Design an enzyme around this catalytic site. Sequence first.
Site, PDB file in Angstrom:
ATOM      1  N   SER A  55     -14.087   3.708 -18.498  1.00  0.00           N
ATOM      2  CA  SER A  55     -13.466   2.407 -18.271  1.00  0.00           C
ATOM      3  C   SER A  55     -14.351   1.478 -17.450  1.00  0.00           C
ATOM      4  O   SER A  55     -14.417   0.281 -17.721  1.00  0.00           O
ATOM      5  CB  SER A  55     -12.112   2.581 -17.581  1.00  0.00           C
ATOM      6  OG  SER A  55     -11.209   3.292 -18.410  1.00  0.00           O
ATOM      7  N   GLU A  91       1.199  -1.916  -2.840  1.00  0.00           N
ATOM      8  CA  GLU A  91       1.101  -0.919  -1.781  1.00  0.00           C
ATOM      9  C   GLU A  91       2.278  -1.000  -0.813  1.00  0.00           C
ATOM     10  O   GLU A  91       2.605  -0.024  -0.141  1.00  0.00           O
ATOM     11  CB  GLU A  91      -0.215  -1.084  -1.017  1.00  0.00           C
ATOM     12  CG  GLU A  91      -0.638   0.143  -0.228  1.00  0.00           C
ATOM     13  CD  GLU A  91      -1.176   1.252  -1.113  1.00  0.00           C
ATOM     14  OE1 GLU A  91      -1.762   0.941  -2.173  1.00  0.00           O
ATOM     15  OE2 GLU A  91      -1.007   2.435  -0.751  1.00  0.00           O
ATOM     16  N   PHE A 117      -7.788   1.161  -3.085  1.00  0.00           N
ATOM     17  CA  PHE A 117      -6.711   1.249  -2.100  1.00  0.00           C
ATOM     18  C   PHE A 117      -5.764   2.401  -2.409  1.00  0.00           C
ATOM     19  O   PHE A 117      -5.095   2.921  -1.517  1.00  0.00           O
ATOM     20  CB  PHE A 117      -5.925  -0.062  -2.047  1.00  0.00           C
ATOM     21  CG  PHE A 117      -6.243  -0.921  -0.856  1.00  0.00           C
ATOM     22  CD1 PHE A 117      -7.383  -1.702  -0.831  1.00  0.00           C
ATOM     23  CD2 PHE A 117      -5.386  -0.960   0.233  1.00  0.00           C
ATOM     24  CE1 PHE A 117      -7.674  -2.501   0.264  1.00  0.00           C
ATOM     25  CE2 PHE A 117      -5.669  -1.757   1.330  1.00  0.00           C
ATOM     26  CZ  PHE A 117      -6.814  -2.528   1.345  1.00  0.00           C
ATOM     27  N   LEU A 130      -3.956   4.037   6.747  1.00  0.00           N
ATOM     28  CA  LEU A 130      -3.799   5.394   7.256  1.00  0.00           C
ATOM     29  C   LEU A 130      -4.046   5.464   8.762  1.00  0.00           C
ATOM     30  O   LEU A 130      -5.092   5.039   9.253  1.00  0.00           O
ATOM     31  CB  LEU A 130      -4.746   6.347   6.522  1.00  0.00           C
ATOM     32  CG  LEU A 130      -4.661   7.825   6.899  1.00  0.00           C
ATOM     33  CD1 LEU A 130      -3.267   8.372   6.627  1.00  0.00           C
ATOM     34  CD2 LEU A 130      -5.711   8.624   6.147  1.00  0.00           C
ATOM     35  N   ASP A 153       4.213   8.957   5.094  1.00  0.00           N
ATOM     36  CA  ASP A 153       3.889   9.021   3.672  1.00  0.00           C
ATOM     37  C   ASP A 153       4.664  10.137   2.976  1.00  0.00           C
ATOM     38  O   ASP A 153       5.157  11.059   3.627  1.00  0.00           O
ATOM     39  CB  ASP A 153       2.382   9.219   3.480  1.00  0.00           C
ATOM     40  CG  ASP A 153       1.926   8.905   2.068  1.00  0.00           C
ATOM     41  OD1 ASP A 153       2.593   8.093   1.394  1.00  0.00           O
ATOM     42  OD2 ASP A 153       0.901   9.470   1.634  1.00  0.00           O
ATOM     43  N   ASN A 198      -8.002   1.826 -22.998  1.00  0.00           N
ATOM     44  CA  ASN A 198      -8.499   3.116 -22.541  1.00  0.00           C
ATOM     45  C   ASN A 198      -7.884   3.539 -21.214  1.00  0.00           C
ATOM     46  O   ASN A 198      -7.645   4.725 -20.982  1.00  0.00           O
ATOM     47  CB  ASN A 198     -10.021   3.085 -22.420  1.00  0.00           C
ATOM     48  CG  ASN A 198     -10.587   4.391 -21.914  1.00  0.00           C
ATOM     49  OD1 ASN A 198     -10.684   5.368 -22.657  1.00  0.00           O
ATOM     50  ND2 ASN A 198     -10.964   4.419 -20.641  1.00  0.00           N
TER      51      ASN A 198
END
Length: 445
Positions: A313, A207, A300, A228, A216, A328
């Site tokens: 999944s 991140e 996240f 944020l 952003d 997958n």
Amino acid sequence: VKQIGAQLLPPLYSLVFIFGFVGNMLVVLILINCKKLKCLTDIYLLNLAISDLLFLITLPLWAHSAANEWVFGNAMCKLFTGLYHIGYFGGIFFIILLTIDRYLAIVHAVFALKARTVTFGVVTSVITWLVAVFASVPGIIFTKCQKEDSVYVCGPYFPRGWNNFHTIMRNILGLVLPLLIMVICYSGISRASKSRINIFEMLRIDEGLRLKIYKDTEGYYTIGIGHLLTKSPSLNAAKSELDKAIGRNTNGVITKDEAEKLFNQDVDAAVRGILRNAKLKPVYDSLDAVRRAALINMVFQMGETGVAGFTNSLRMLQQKRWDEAAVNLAKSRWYNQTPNRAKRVITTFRTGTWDAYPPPSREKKAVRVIFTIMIVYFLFWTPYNIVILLNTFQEFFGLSNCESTSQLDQATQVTETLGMTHCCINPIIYAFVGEKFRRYLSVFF
Ligand SMILES: CCC[C@@H]1C[C@H](N(C)C(C)C)CC[C@@H]1N1CC[C@H](Nc2ncnc3ccc(C(F)(F)F)cc23)C1=O
Ligand SMILES: CCCCCCCC/C=C\CCCCCCCC(=O)OC[C@H](O)CO
Ligand SMILES: CC(=O)C1=C(O)C(=O)N(c2ccc(Cl)cc2F)[C@@H]1C1CCCCC1
Ligand SMILES: [Zn+2]
């Protein structure tokens, strides 16, 4: 023994004094004029340096007495005995504090990070100096200037019971306590991770880390590790939301520790959300701490709604079919859009290890320095602690002879001499092991 002492102790202690004084003085000058004493760890290192100084300023007096005899009086004798003991106990105590601090830091103990303040430093330093003083009081009280065999000596004169107590007390505070502390730390380190990698390092790579308010790619405002602030153009609005989340006038700039503090608030909030989602909860409960982190990683990035989209999944992860779930996931839209981040997350889920990520450097190098400091301390002061323990308690158990006490005294003198040469070692260890210290020296010259 006095003949050998008069020829050896004055030049030895003088050489120790010169190296140790300029050494610990340089440490202090750096901590004040380069680090400016802004970090908690700067406070402890400062007090550790002071401990050594308080010790080695007494050396010229001990060296002079070995050449001649004690001539400074009784009051002066009890005074420098005080500095001798306080400087010593203060030394080992602040080494233990640093040991704990850097241990808690590499395990990313939340409360320790919230405690890593100069306020917490000053307070616990004052208490540390107190305990150092109270552990010096017995030594001060029963130490006097007395004429022995027509020669003045500044020596200890404990009663029978008090010498026994002093011996076991010194061994506890100077050996048993540090040894136990270090074992706890070594265990807690080896139990946390073999790669020393935490979720902090993972999401720092994936991140990123924002120290200044980052806009952003879409137009949102973020800070730290994916936090944020707001979704609307005004940077003033962004600063407003941030200055509230910190409790400080930031001007749009954050510190590294303030980022992790925010990061911890965002992690448990994500976990809170996961454990409140009907499709993410059973999956999260069947995962270990490593694979759980990878799931928090996905939250996240895409949010719980997006993660809940991976219905296939998630079921396969819930069923511990790591290999098949890995394949997958490599077919998803999420994978192809951000391949490098996804790839190392898929690896985490498949292997259940941190092999997809680089380990921390400075965090490991930090505990390398402070553990070395303590190990070397052990080397210099343990032979003394043991021989006086033999010369006290276990001389009653066995080891009894007429020439025994005399020889045990000789060993006590030699070993204590060895320990006295330790007050000049710490700055040398800094220069050889510590890279930040050498950097501070580079900007000093
Ligand atoms: C000479 C003054 C001794 C002085 C006592 C003081 N003490 C604990 C309290 C008063 C604080 C602490 C500091 C000083 N000490 C404590 C012992 C230490 N080694 C020695 N002491 C006195 N003669 C020695 C002769 C030869 C040798 C060698 F091994 F080298 F041959 C070592 C000696 C020392 O030095
Ligand atoms: C006179 C003969 C004795 C003199 C010699 C004694 C000197 C020993 C000093 C320090 C030992 C090393 C301390 C290491 C500190 C811990 C290192 C660590 O924990 O980090 C490793 C990391 O896990 C890797 O991946
Ligand atoms: C990794 C790290 O924090 C340090 C070094 O790599 C270094 O040389 N340091 C360092 C800084 C100032 C002084 Cl005076 C001495 C030091 F060894 C810091 C220490 C921080 C306290 C715990 C031990 C490492
Ligand atoms: Zn870490």
